Amino acid sequence: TIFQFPQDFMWGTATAAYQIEGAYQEDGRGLSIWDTFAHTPGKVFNGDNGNVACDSYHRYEEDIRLMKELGIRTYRFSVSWPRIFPNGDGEVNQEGLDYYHRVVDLLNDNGIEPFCTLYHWDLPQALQDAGGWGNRRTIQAFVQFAETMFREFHGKIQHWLTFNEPWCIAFLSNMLGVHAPGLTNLQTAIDVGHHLLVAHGLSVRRFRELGTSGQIGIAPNVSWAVPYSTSEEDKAACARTISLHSDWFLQPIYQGSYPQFLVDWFAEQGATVPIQDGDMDIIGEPIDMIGINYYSMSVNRFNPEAGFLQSEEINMGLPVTDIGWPVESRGLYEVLHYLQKYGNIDIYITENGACINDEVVNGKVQDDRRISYMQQHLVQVHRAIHDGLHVKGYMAWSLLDNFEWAEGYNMRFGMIHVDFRTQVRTPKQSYYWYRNVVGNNWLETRR
């Protein structure tokens, strides 16, 4: 079947600062909560860390030349907060800003639109020492960081994202303790979540006041769960799983309130959102679009012992990627329609890809399973567009294999293989497949 995409559909790739840059102590860069987390025994597989990574701090010219020959139109990357404000102290580090100027100018020189993610989990450790995100003072610090970026890169960046995956920053990091700072306290996670939102709203307001060019939004990772049974409890368990990922952040932004159920659910566990007068009005600041990050879908059932959401995921026996996630692309189509509850808003698939660990053999990386995964999901994207939904673009998660957080370098997601012993780049077969798709602007599934 032939799937033809819109004339101005935006094709791209994505990365994150700490996962590819390296040079963690270079040019005055301060430490982030992830440097600390990764340097702690038992937090990251094999003791891997973001020192060096893909050394993209030095090899960005090569990476850009590679994405250029891919035919891509945009590149999503994030800004290392501690490279700009080593202590989130207000004392700017020009060397840090200069790095992004080099990357951005080279991007614009190659006709590639920068898609800037301001916050991709690397909160300066100095700020964490005072409570990081748990402390409202951090809100003011982010706004200064954001404003600095808006003033410095005005006209050079037309697409901005305040936060990448609030659910991970708040709950995965402060409730489940899997990501930095690795805490396990419901109240703290809720505090972090609320403060991210306020910080987001204020940043958007400054963006507007400053007259910065471009559009600005936020990029939540979206979840999707379907009930194992037709029971009301299973249905409720799925509602919680889905809502905590998107609705808990999007309802405040689009409708001015936290999902009541869940608020009640958390109250039962003794937790309450630290809402202060004016907060909700701030969070309700209008945004131009949102980024959606999708990887998988699940079948859940109510289970009193299954985590703080009492929602158990059933292993349905579907094949999984090398990181253990089942592939079921329909979830992307289902959640895109679900999200229409906020209106037919502009949506970019900022994140989508698969962990496939195939290595270089005979000079190539035969990652057929990655091609298969991307094909299936791009079909759902076309399907959504065909339903009249405003899905504006797609960004393959990761141009390069990189530091996959707590998994270390063991889990590869790139379309370009990186041998971390030499830093040599080897485009995978998925890279050439993707180059053809973006170049033609249409896709074909064949037996």
Ligand X SMILES: O=[N+]([O-])c1ccc(O[C@@H]2O[C@H](CO)[C@@H](O)[C@H](O)[C@H]2F)c([N+](=O)[O-])c1
Ligand Y SMILES: *[C@H]1O[C@H](CO)[C@@H](O)[C@H](O)[C@H]1F
Which residues between 259 and 298 bind ligand Y (CB under 6 A)? 293
Q: Which stretch binds a copy of itself (CB under 8 A): 130-138, 261-269, 349-357, 434-442?
A: 434-442
Spatial CB neighbours of 278, under 8 Å, sequence gap ≥ 6:
none
Residues 393-412 contacting ligand Y, CB under 6 A: 397, 404
408, burial (CB in 10 Å: exposed 0-12, middle 13-18, buried 19+)? middle
Catalytically annotated residue among 21, 113, 328, 351: 351
Shortest Cβ 349–ligand Y spacing (Å): 11
Q: Among ligand Y, a copy of itself, ligand X, none, what binds residue 105 when CB lies within 5 to 8 Å by partner kind?
A: none
Q: Could you give the CA distance from residue 385 to residue 330 in angstroms, rounded to a whole number?
A: 14
Q: Name which position in 164, 173, 174, 251 contacts ligand Y (CB under 6 A).
A: 164
Q: Which of 362, 226, 351 is nearest to 290 (CA)?
A: 351
* Cβ closest to ligand X, residue 143 vs residue 196: 143
Residue closer to ligand X, measured from CB, 136 or 330 = 136
Report which of 447, 443, 431, 440 is spatially closest to residue 68, judged by C-alpha positions: 431
Q: CA-to-CA distance for 294 and 289, rounded, in angstroms? A: 16
Query: DSSP string covering 80-107, please?
Result: -HHHHSTTSSS---HHHHHHHHHHHHHH
Distance between CA atoms of residues 90 and 83, nearest Å: 12
**Contacted entry of ligand Y, ligand X, a copy of itself, none for residue 143, CB cut-off 5 to 8 Å set by kind:** ligand X
User: Helix axis angle, 429-440 relative to 368-386, nearest 10°?
Assistant: 20
Give the strands of the sheet with 225-227, arranged side by side: 225-227, 298-302, 311-314
Instruction: List binders of a copy of itself among 13-72 (CB under 8 A).
Output: 39, 41-42, 46-49, 51
For residue 321, CA distances in Å to 108, 130, 318 come to 35, 39, 10
What is the C-alpha separation between 228 and 114, in angstroms, rounded?
Answer: 42
Decide: 73 and 10 in contact? Cβ < 8 Å: yes
**Binder among 9, 10, 11, 16 for ligand Y (CB under 6 A):** 16
The binder of 444, among ligand X, a copy of itself, ligand Y, none, by C-beta within 5 to 8 A per type, is a copy of itself
Catalytic residue among 113, 165, 312, 334: 165
Q: Please measure the distance between the N-terminal and C-terminal CA atoms of the chain and give it in whole angstroms.
A: 10
Among the listed ranges 80-88, 141-149, 244-252, 375-383, the one in contact with a copy of itself (CB under 8 A) is: 375-383
Using rule CB under 6 A, residue 198 touches ligand X:
yes
Active site residue 351: yes
Among residues 184, 213, 229, 257, which is the contact residue for a copy of itself, using CB under 8 A? 229
- Provide the 3-class DSSP secondary structure of residue 396: strand
Site for ligand X in 346-375 (CB under 6 A): none
The distance of closest approach from Cβ of residue 351 to ligand Y in the complex, given in angstroms and rounded to an integer, is 5
Helix, strand, coil content of the chain in percent (nearest 5): 45, 20, 40
Q: Which two tokens stand for residue 172?
A: 């995965």
Please, which residue, 289 or 389, has the CB nearer to a copy of itself? Answer: 389
The site for ligand Y, by CB under 6 A, has a size of 7
| 202 interacts with, out of a copy of itself, ligand X, ligand Y, none, CB within 5 to 8 A per kind | ligand X
Confirm or reject binding of residue 435 to ligand X (CB under 6 A): no
Among positions 275-334, residues that touch a copy of itself (CB under 8 A) are 314-320, 324, 329
Residue 160 phi, psi (nearest 5):
-130, 145
Q: Which residues 112-151 are close enough to bind ligand X by CB under 6 A? A: 136-137, 139-140, 143
61 assigned to active site: no
Contacted entry of ligand Y, a copy of itself, ligand X, none for residue 136, CB cut-off 5 to 8 Å set by kind: ligand X
Q: Name the token pair of 157.
A: 């960046």
Least distance (Å) between residue 242 CB and ligand Y: 17
Q: Which lies closer to ligand X via its Cβ, residue 145 or residue 167?
A: 145
Pick the stretch among 98-106, 173-181, 368-376, 410-418 that binds a copy of itself (CB under 8 A): 368-376
Q: Binding marks (x or -) toward ligand Y, 360..399, rule CB under 6 A?
A: -------------------------------------x--
Work out what residue 404 binds among a copy of itself, ligand X, ligand Y, none; the CB cut-off runs from 5 to 8 Å by kind. ligand Y
Q: Is the Cβ–Cβ distance between 20 and 53 less than 8 Å?
A: yes
List helix spans (H) across 153-268.
Answer: 166-167, 173-174, 186-210, 232-245, 247-255, 260-268
CB of 268 to ligand Y, least distance (A): 30
HSE of 52 in the Cβ direction (CA atoms, 13 Å)? 10
Catalytically active residues are 165, 351
Q: Which residues of the shown chain bind ligand Y in the complex (CB under 6 A)?
A: 16, 164-165, 293, 351, 397, 404
Q: Which residues of the shown chain bind ligand X in the complex (CB under 6 A)?
A: 136-137, 139-140, 143, 198, 202
